[PDB]
Amino acid sequence: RAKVAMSHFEPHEYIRYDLLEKNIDIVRKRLNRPLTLSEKIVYGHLDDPANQEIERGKTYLRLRPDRVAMQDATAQMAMLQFISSGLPKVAVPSTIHCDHLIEAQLGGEKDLRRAKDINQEVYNFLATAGAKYGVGFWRPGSGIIHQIILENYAYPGVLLIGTDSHTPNGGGLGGICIGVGGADAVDVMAGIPWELKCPKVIGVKLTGSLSGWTSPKDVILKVAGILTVKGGTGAIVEYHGPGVDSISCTGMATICNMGAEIGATTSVFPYNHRMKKYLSKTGRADIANLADEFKDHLVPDSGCHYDQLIEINLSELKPHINGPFTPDLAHPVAEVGSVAEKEGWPLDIRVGLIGSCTNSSYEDMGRSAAVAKQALAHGLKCKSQFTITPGSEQIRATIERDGYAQVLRDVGGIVLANACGPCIGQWDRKDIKKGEKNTIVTSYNRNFTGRNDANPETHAFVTSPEIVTALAIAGTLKFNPETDFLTGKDGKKFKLEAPDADELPRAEFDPGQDTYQHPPKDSSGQRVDVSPTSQRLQLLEPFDKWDGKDLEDLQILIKVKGKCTTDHISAAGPWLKFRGHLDNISNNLLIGAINSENRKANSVRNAVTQEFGPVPDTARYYKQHGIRWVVIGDENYGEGSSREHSALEPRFLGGRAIITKSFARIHETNLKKQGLLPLTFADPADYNKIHPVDKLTIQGLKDFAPGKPLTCIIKHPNGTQETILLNHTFNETQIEWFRAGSALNRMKELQQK
Ligand SMILES: O=C([O-])/C=C(/C(=O)[O-])[C@@H](O)C(=O)[O-]
Ligand code: SF4
């Protein structure tokens, strides 16, 4: 067909739209109905399009991704599992991105130089393992993973999986990009088919056009308030409508990105002329030309059926700010001042932060600089502290060149290294004490308890970069940029003008410095060394196979009340130092979850000693004494980040099952991958029948089967027993992971030894 390379770094890997077309055509002859765009790309990547059972929300699809992307806080454990597999090389184009371990302290260059000294052990390990197994490596400083992906790797119709829940960002370029745990990435790098539950499709029809202060971020802050953090679970969100051509390509990526906060499997936009423009400006005019020839397959079919349809009129949409402790608590910026006052949220803004993968593009930096230049023209500077993270080295070099970075420095901002930084808590924050109540406003996406600075009393609000800039200048949540006045140096009252800025550089992007390291695919004679006394890296010892018995008289380690994100289960921030060391990072297990017994975080009753203490210590005491334990959870357990450490850590410390009212998708898959049993209440009111003091017997594991419930006997201390039923979503592939002790153990069994 055409021989168009997948990226500038893989000149020999060609885009296979011929394959995609071929598969869409097998499937539509079977289904005889219009297909949505996400159905065309997902079913077009089926391992077996002729025989695959396709029922939305019901069957598990066996798929063949085009490429794998990893960031350095999850790549370490994905590569340690890959090293256990014993396989010699990755089977599909794969990259490692070093963006999560650079701490914000001194700003830009000084922080990067310091992270390279401090994290030498880990960057060495990832570069060496990348060279040995044929994985491309983007060096520290290169940029946040999703911005490097949109700039170099995402294209219309790609199916990309990434070890990061914001991999959906690539939906801004018409690809299906899905976040997974490290063990799922091991499946694809190993060449075995990846399984995904067939998604429902929510359509969001965009009407009108964005005007003034309203930005792409407001579309997804509004959708999150409408759908709530659990409303997109099990579905792909497909944006369509006349309003789409009003949004820039990085704007569409912003909206697809934060679809992660409603639990969606991913989000996508149809191929259109804004995408084409972005592809040509990023040196990929040949891919835009090929996608023009296959365009029918890169837009939805006429009259396709959405399981839910939402319509948003972009012209009536106004600026929003979401939070404080969930991203779906949505307020118009015009009302946040009064709600904060009413609710006791601090009105003074201590720090305004722009960046993260959600809002770090060239256009976001231009729109922020446009607010800031107006303040500067009146002799004002920021009243709040103000930090700026460029998304990639190319964006940093270009905003510097085009003058935006100096405007942002002159109003009072500090430009940080091209890295996650304060978004995953990598921030040496010293202006507040721990436990001090304060408000920060960010252009990030999550605002979970203690995630940005480890202070559970920080009230963080997420909004657009131009509203962060306007609120940082005013210093208070009681300031609406659309209606209120500032007072210049000169004594006159002035109003801020709605920002306007170019979506892309008029001139070409300046690439900045060299940060990609291609694998030698010649040599590969690297020995990967992991020192046996390392505190940051540890080779894995396989988990135990199932003993063949039911699980009787399980102790409850903790019955969790309310919201329990993966940041509650396995905190980030300072714990990122141990992301390649399972035993050391297991010391944070569930320290943020709230215990229903006493309403406290990290304080549970040891059943043997009758002392209340830290959850990790108590799980290790039970493991030491052979007591097998369970966690009981509430709704949407494991919400948030894809980090598989939230499943590896309970397995490592002796946990057996997690029984909840519902699970977020990636965490439920990570639990099944590590040989734990994620089970849900067949009647969610049974959560109230289980007391912290009960012992539980799970029965029926011997004829464990897809669609059959398991029985749970609740043994109350007074002698009363009650039987309840527990549902699971295991298919027979996944039951084999459980019988083997983990999916990795199962994979190694199939190696005929
Ligand atoms: O902890 C991790 O390295 C995983 C992430 C994820 O999958 O989203 C992180 O980027 C985040 O934002 O929590
Ligand atoms: S959400 Fe934050 S921590 Fe996760 S990839 Fe994006 S910028 Fe990094």
Residue of 164, 184, 442 to mutate, ligand 1, most atoms within 8 A of C-beta: 164
**417 within 8 A of 98, measured Cβ to Cβ:** no
Are residues 41 and 161 both part of a single domain? yes
Residue of 423, 639, 666 to mutate, ligand 2, most atoms within 8 A of C-beta: 423
Are residues 249 and 163 both part of a single domain? no
Own/partner pairs for 651-654, CB < 8 Å, 24+ apart? 651/543, 651/675, 651/676, 651/742, 652/543, 652/582, 652/583, 652/586, 653/586, 653/589, 653/616, 653/619, 653/620, 653/622, 653/623, 654/619, 654/620, 654/622, 654/623, 654/627, 654/628, 654/629
Q: Is 320 in the pocket of ligand 1 (CB under 6 A)?
A: no
**How many CB atoms sit inside 10 A of residue 702's CB?**
8
**DSSP codes joined into one string, 462-507:** E--HHHHHHHHHH-BSS--TTT-EEE-TTS-EEEPPPP---SS-SS
Contacts of 214 (CB under 8 A, 6+ apart): 314, 317, 318, 319
Structure tokens at 290: 């090929």
Own/partner pairs for 10-16, CB < 8 Å, 24+ apart? 10/93, 13/93, 15/155, 15/157, 15/287, 15/290, 16/66
Residue of 72, 167, 424 to mutate, ligand 1, most atoms within 8 A of C-beta: 424
Degrees (nearest 5) of the Cα angle 305, 310, 312? 130
> Cα of 102 to ligand 1 centre, how many Å?
14
> Cα of 161 to ligand 1 centre, how many Å?
14
Residue 177 known to bind ligand: no
Residue 304 known to bind ligand: no
Q: Which atom of ligand 1 is least distant from the CA of 642?
A: 7
Q: Which atom of ligand 1 is least distant from the CA of 179?
A: 7
Which ligand is the nearest neighbour of the Cα of 423? 2
Q: Which atom of ligand 2 is least distant from the CA of 99?
A: 8
Structure tokens at 62: 């066996």
745: in domain: yes
516: in domain: no
Are residues 157 and 292 both part of a single domain? no
Which residue has the least CA distance to atom 6 on ligand 2? 357
Q: Which atom of ligand 1 is least distant from the CA of 260?
A: 8
Method of determination used here: X-ray
Asked if 443 is an active-site residue, the reply is no
Residue 274 to residues 201, 278, 358, 441: CA-CA distances in angstroms? 23, 6, 18, 30
Q: Which atom of ligand 2 is least distant from the CA of 446?
A: 1
Which ligand is the nearest neighbour of the Cα of 426? 2
Which residue has the least CA distance to atom 2 on ligand 2? 423
502: in domain: no
* Helical packing angle, 145-152 and 249-257, nearest 10°: 140
Are residues 328 and 421 both part of a single domain? yes
Quote the CA–CA distance of 667 and 631 in Å, as a whole number: 14
Are residues 326 and 249 both part of a single domain? no
217: in domain: yes
**How many CB atoms sit inside 10 A of residue 492's CB?**
10
Please say which residue of 455, 489, 523 terminates a domain: 489
**DSSP codes joined into one string, 669-716:** HHHHHTT-EEEEESSGGGGGG--TT-EEEEE-GGG--TTPPEEEEEE-
Which residue has the least CA distance to atom 3 on ligand 2? 424
Q: Which atom of ligand 2 is least distant from the CA of 145?
A: 5
512: in domain: no
Structure tokens at 353: 């932060």
For residues 73, 76, 77, 83, the Cα torsion angle rounded to the nearest 10 degrees is 170
Pairing of strands 413-415, 385-388: parallel
Are residues 295 and 321 both part of a single domain? no
Task: Please identify which of the residues 164, 328, 634, 686 carries the catalytic annotation.
Answer: 164
Pairing of strands 136-138, 516-517: antiparallel
495: in domain: no
Report the first-to-last Cα separation within the chain, whole angstroms.
41
Quote the CA–CA distance of 30 and 743 in Å, as a whole number: 32
Residue 16 known to bind ligand: no
Q: Which residue has the tokens 């969100």?
A: 237
How far is Cα of residue 130 from the mean position of the Cα atoms in its chain? 22
CB-hemisphere CA count at 13 Å for 418?
A: 29
Which residue has the least CA distance to atom 9 on ligand 1? 641
> Cα of 666 to ligand 1 centre, how many Å?
12
Q: Is 642 in the pocket of ligand 1 (CB under 6 A)?
A: yes
Are residues 225 and 124 both part of a single domain? no
> Cα of 641 to ligand 1 centre, how many Å?
5
Task: Please identify which of the residues 320, 350, 446, 651 carries the catalytic annotation.
Answer: 446
How far is Cα of residue 722 from the mean position of the Cα atoms in its chain? 39
Contacts of 753 (CB under 8 A, 6+ apart): none
Q: Could you list the residue range(s) of the whole structural domain that residue 276 is in?
A: 202-314
Are residues 677 and 737 both part of a single domain? yes
**230 within 8 A of 263, measured Cβ to Cβ:** yes
469 closest CA partner among 536, 534, 374: 374
Residue 734 known to bind ligand: no
Asked if 643 is an active-site residue, the reply is yes
**How many CB atoms sit inside 10 A of residue 51's CB?**
10
**601 within 8 A of 593, measured Cβ to Cβ:** yes
Are residues 565 and 705 both part of a single domain? yes
Please say which residue of 265, 285, 314 terminates a domain: 314
How far is Cα of residue 180 from the mean position of the Cα atoms in its chain? 9
The 8-class DSSP code of residue 173 comes to G
Asked if 378 is an active-site residue, the reply is no
Rg (CA), the chain: 25
Are residues 308 and 337 both part of a single domain? no
Q: Which sign does the torsion angle of CA 595, 228, 65, 395 carry?
A: negative
CB-hemisphere CA count at 13 Å for 632?
A: 26
Domain of 732: which CATH number?
Answer: 3.20.19.10
For residue 360, count CB atoms less than 10 angstroms from its CB and return exposed for 0-12, middle for 13-18, buried for 19 or more.
buried
Structure tokens at 730: 């295991």
Asked if 99 is an active-site residue, the reply is yes
> Cα of 195 to ligand 2 centre, how many Å?
25
**112 within 8 A of 140, measured Cβ to Cβ:** yes
Contacts of 25 (CB under 8 A, 6+ apart): none
Q: Is 641 in the pocket of ligand 1 (CB under 6 A)?
A: yes
Contacts of 536 (CB under 8 A, 6+ apart): 121, 122, 577, 578, 580, 581, 584
Quote the CA–CA distance of 408 and 548 in Å, as a whole number: 63
- With a Cβ cut-off of 6 Å, ligand 2 is lined by 144-145, 164, 166, 356-357, 420, 423-424, 445
722 closest CA partner among 693, 689, 699: 689
At 251 the three-state DSSP class reads: helix
The structural domain count of the chain equals 4
Residue 249 known to bind ligand: no
Contacts of 589 (CB under 8 A, 6+ apart): 569, 570, 615, 616, 619, 649, 650, 653
Beta strands in 163-286 (DSSP E): 176-179, 194-197, 200-207, 235-240, 266-268
Domain of 188: which CATH number?
Answer: 3.30.499.10
> Cα of 643 to ligand 1 centre, how many Å?
6
Which ligand is the nearest neighbour of the Cα of 72? 1
For residue 460, count CB atoms less than 10 angstroms from its CB and return exposed for 0-12, middle for 13-18, buried for 19 or more.
buried
> Cα of 130 to ligand 2 centre, how many Å?
22
498: in domain: no
Q: Which atom of ligand 1 is least distant from the CA of 645?
A: 1
Task: Please identify which of the residues 568, 643, 645, 656 carries the catalytic annotation.
Answer: 643
Residue 536 known to bind ligand: no
Q: Is 166 in the pocket of ligand 1 (CB under 6 A)?
A: yes
Report resolution (Å) to 1 decimal: 2.0
Are residues 642 and 699 both part of a single domain? yes
Are residues 333 and 407 both part of a single domain? yes
> Cα of 159 to ligand 2 centre, how many Å?
20
Degrees (nearest 5) of the Cα angle 16, 22, 23? 95
**DSSP codes joined into one string, 213-224:** T--HHHHHHHHH
> Cα of 212 to ligand 1 centre, how many Å?
32
Please say which residue of 168, 201, 234 terminates a domain: 201
Asked if 392 is an active-site residue, the reply is no
262: in domain: yes
Domain of 215: which CATH number?
Answer: 3.40.1060.10
